[PDB]
Structure formats: structure tokens, C-alpha cells
């Protein structure tokens, strides 16, 4: 009930997206590697 969530850290989406770009992620090429359009 008062069994609360720790705040859901928005930065763990954002530093995660930066980690993908740093590792050389392309939303075009890796979608094409899955046979799918952006």
C-alpha cells in the first residue's frame, strides 16, 4: 500500500540512448537489419 516506488530515473533512458549512439547505433540501418522501416 504505502509500498512506494523509488523515482523512475528519466536519465536511465537518456544516458542509455547516448550509450547506443556512442556504440554506433543507427535507427535506419539496424531497423533494415530487422527487415523493418523506420
Amino acid at each position: 500500500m504505502q509500498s512506494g516506488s523509488r523515482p523512475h530515473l528519466a536519465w536511465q533512458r537518456e544516458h542509455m540512448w547516448l550509450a547506443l549512439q556512442g556504440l554506433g547505433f543507427e535507427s535506419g540501418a539496424e531497423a533494415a537489419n530487422a527487415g523493418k522501416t523506420l
Binding site: 536519465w11 537518456e14 547516448l18 549512439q21 556512442g22 554506433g24
Partner: protein, 58 residues
Amino acid sequence: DVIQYPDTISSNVILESLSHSTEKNVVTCIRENEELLKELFSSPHFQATLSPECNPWP
């Protein structure tokens, strides 16, 4: 290198209470790093810097 130069000698900020300075300086640096990383990573050049090649040769 990490011992940044004294260029603007801000005379008073040498010994005012570090225990109420450090957390501000951490938050301001986290903010600088979020801005700098978000605006580095907005550049189209940001994969070429990380994988450089050059050919002047005709």
C-alpha cells in the same frame, strides 16, 4: 592538466564552507555534462570523430 589555471582569481571562494559548495558544483557539472553530451550527440559529425579517416592524395 586537471589543475585548471587561476585566470580569474575569485579571491573569496577559497575557503567558504565546502560542505555547502560541493553538491552545487556536482549538480552544475552534471548539468554542463547533460547539455554538452546532448549537443555533441546532436551533430552529424559525431560518428566521424569517433572513426576518423583522411585522404589529401589525388
